[PDB]
From a paper:
Inter- and intramolecular cooperative effects in the homodimer strongly depend on the provided metal ions and regulate the biosynthetic flux of terpene precursors to either biological defence or physiological development.
To elucidate the structural features of FPP formation in the closed state, we applied IPP together with a geranyl pyrophosphate derivative brominated at position C3 (3-Br-[name]).
Numbering used by the authors:
A (entry chain A): 87 to 107, 111 to 328, 331 to 427
B (entry chain B): 86 to 184, 202 to 328, 334 to 426
C-alpha cells in the first residue's frame, strides 16, 4: 500500500531528531545523524513495514487507531535500526565493496574500523527510541527483552557462519544441511521473520508464549525457504540489477551444501580447488558444476514441496492465531 | 577490597558462563555456544575487576545493614559482572582496532549482559531502572568513543580540536559514565534508591573523580616508571591539551611536526617539550587543587548519601 509506505517513511526523521536533537557535544551528535541517515532509511524497508502489517492483522480492528499504527511504525524502525547495525558490522567483517549498490559505511572516508563503534551505537540507539514511546505501556519490557534476545541469537548465527571459514578459505567439511539450517535460523530468520511478528503480537498485548512458539515454528520454515531462494537466485537470477558474488565470497550457500551432497569425488575436488576464489574463471567453473549437478531442477522440486508442507502447517495453526497473516507472508516470499 | 569480598565476587563468574552458554538447555548449536564460552572465559574474568567489585562495595555501603543478606550481596556481584561484561566488550573493540577474536564478539559480549540482567533481575522492582541505566550508559559510551575519534583525520591528530572542553567531554562520555557512575547507580537501584536528586548528587562527585583518574592516567603515560604510546597514537591526552595551552608559536610548531608520529625520536621530542613546558609542575598543582575540591564536595554531599563510599573511591584513585 502507498499510504502504509509513506506513513511509515515519515516516522524516520522524527526518530533521527529523538536520537540527536547532549547539547555539550554537537559535533558527535551531528555525526550520529549522518550515521543514521546513510545506513537506516535507504532502499526497501521490508522488515519495518512487515512489523506494521503484522500488527494490523493481529490487533482487534477497533484498536487500530492512527496512534497505535504509528507505534507499530516506530517498532518497525527499531527493527531497521537493529538491521542497520548488523549490516554495518557484516560489511566490515566480509570486506564488501557495496550493499544495495551503495558503498559500505566502513569504506567512507575516516570510518574504517570506527564502523565497529557505529554498529554498537546504532544498536544501542533503538532502546532509547523504545524508552521514549513505550515506557508507559505493558509491552515495554517484553519488547526490550525480545530485541536483546534476537541480538544475542543473531550473533550466534554470525559466529556459526564464521566457523565455516578459516583464514579467508571455506571449510567444505563444515558445509552440511544441518549447519546451513542453523546459520539461517539464528543469523537471519530470528530478526527478519520472528522479530516483526512477535513485535506485532506484543503491541496487540498477546503475551502467551505458546502463541509466539506456534508463530516461530511457521516463521522459521518460511525463513529457511526465503534464504534458500535468495541463495539460488545469487547464481541463477537475471542480473534485478545485482551481480551475485556468493561463490567468490566462499559462502555456506544452499547451492554449495547441496552441490557437496550430490558430488562424486572428482566433482568434490572442483569445489575444493575453485570455491571461494577471487578469479572470475573459478566462479564460472563452480556455476558450471551447479548446472552439471542439476541444482536448478533440485530447487524447483524443493520450492514446490516446501510450499505444500508450510501451507499444511499454517492450516494446523491454533490458539487463536490468524492464518491470513502467515498465508500473506507465504504469498509475498513464494510470489503465489 | 577484602579477601572475602573478592573471592565471593570471583566465584560468581563460572555460573554466568553456564547461564549464557545454555547449560541445562539442550541446544541445536553446541559448537558456536562452546566457542562463546571460550570468548567469555578468555576476555572477561582476568585482571583486577575494579568496576565489578566497586558495584558490590557501593551496594554494601548504600543498603541498610539488616538487608545485606548473602543473596542480595550475590545479586550486587551479578550486577558487577554485567559491568565487567560491558568493560570486556569495550576492551575487545579496542583490541580489534589495534590488530581468535571475531569482530562481532564485542557486540555479542555487550548483548550478553542484558541476558544476565533478565535472568536475575526481571522480577525485582530495580529491573527497569537498571536496564534503562545500561541502555543510556551504552549509548553515551559510544558517543564518547566517536568524540575521541573526531580528534583524528587521515591518521593525523587535529590539534585545533585538542581543547580542554573537548577533553573533559571525551573523559565524561567515553570513560566516567561506565567506570564511575554505573557501579554506584547500580548499587543505589539494588538498594531501592530511585530519587533522581540522589543519583544527580553522586554523579557530580563521580564525574569529578573520573576526570582526575583519567588526567593522572594521562600524566603517568608519559612520566610514569615502566610503556606509554599516547604520543605515538596522537591521543587527545591532558598533557597534549595543556601543552597547546602553554606553548608559544615555536613550541606549537614542535607539537604540529612530532605529535602522533611512529618514530621513537618524535616521542622523545614531545616528552622533552612537555618537560620544558612545565607539565610535571602543572600536574602537581592540578593534583593538589583537584584533591582539595573533590574532598570538599564529598564533605558537602547531602540528599542522605553516605560520605564513606565516595571517600573510599577518592582514596583508591589518589592513593
Ligand atoms: C551479528 C552480525 C553482525 C550479523 C550479520 C547478519 C547478516 Br543479515 C549478515 C549478512 O549475511 P551475509 O554476509 O552472508 O550476506 P550479505 O552480506 O547480505 O551478501
Ligand atoms: Mg556480508
Ligand atoms: Mg557475512
Ligand atoms: Mg544473498
Ligand atoms: Mg552480498
Ligand atoms: Mg592511558
Amino acid at each position: 500500500s502507498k499510504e502504509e509506505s509513506r506513513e511509515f517513511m515519515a516516522i524516520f526523521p522524527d526518530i533521527v531528531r529523538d536520537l540527536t536533537d547532549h547539547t555539550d557535544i554537537p559535533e558527535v551528535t551531528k555525526r550520529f545523524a549522518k550515521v543514521l541517515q546513510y545506513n537506516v532509511p535507504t532502499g526497501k524497508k521490508t522488515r519495518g513495514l512487515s512489523t506494521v502489517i503484522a500488527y494490523k492483522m493481529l490487533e482487534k480492528p477497533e484498536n487500530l487507531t492512527p496512534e497505535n499504527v504509528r507505534l507499530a511504525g516506530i517498532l518497525g524502525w527499531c527493527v531497521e535500526l537493529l538491521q542497520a547495525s548488523l549490516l554495518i558490522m557484516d560489511d566490515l567483517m566480509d570486506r564488501s565493496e557495496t550493499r544495495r549498490g551503495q558503498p559500505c559505511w566502513y569504506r567512507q572516508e575516516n570510518v574504517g574500523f570506527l564502523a565497529i563503534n557505529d554498529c554498537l551505537h546504532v544498536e544501542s540507539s533503538l532502546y532509547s527510541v523504545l524508552r521514549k514511546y513505550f515506557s508507559h505501556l505493558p509491552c515495554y519490557v517484553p519488547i526490550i527483552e525480545l530485541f536483546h534476545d534476537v541480538n544475542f541469537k543473531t550473533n550466534m548465527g554470525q559466529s556459526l557462519d564464521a566457523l565455516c571459514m578459516k583464514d579467508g578459505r571455506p571449510i567444505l567439511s563444515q558445509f552440511t544441511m544441518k549447519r546451513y539450517s542453523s546459520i539461517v535460523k539464528y543469523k537471519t530468520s530470528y530478526y527478519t521473520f520472528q522479530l516483526p511478528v512477535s513485535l506485532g503480537m506484543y503491541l496487540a498485548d498477546m503475551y502467551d508464549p505458546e502463541q509466539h512458539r506456534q508463530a516461530k515454528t511457521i516463521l522459521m520454515e518460511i525463513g529457511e525457504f526465503f534464504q534458500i531462494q535468495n541463495d539460488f537466485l545469487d547464481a541463477f537470477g537475471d542480473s534485478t540489477g545485482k551481480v551475485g558474488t556468493d561463490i567468490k565470497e566462499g559462502k555456506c550457500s544452499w547451492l554449495a551444501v547441496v552441490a557437496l551432497q550430490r558430488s562424486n569425488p572428482a566433482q568434490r575436488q572442483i569445489m575444493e580447488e575453485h570455491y571461494g576464489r577471487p578469479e572470475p574463471e573459478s566462479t564460472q567453473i563452480i556455476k558450471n558444476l551447479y548446472i552439471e549437478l542439476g541444482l536448478p531442477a533440485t530447487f524447483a522440486v524443493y520450492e514446490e514441496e516446501s510450499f505444500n508442507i508450510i501451507r499444511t502447517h499454517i492450516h494446523q495453526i491454533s490458539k487463536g492465531l490468524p492464518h491470513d497473516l502467515f498465508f500473506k507472508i507465504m504469498k509475498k516470499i513464494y510470489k503465489r
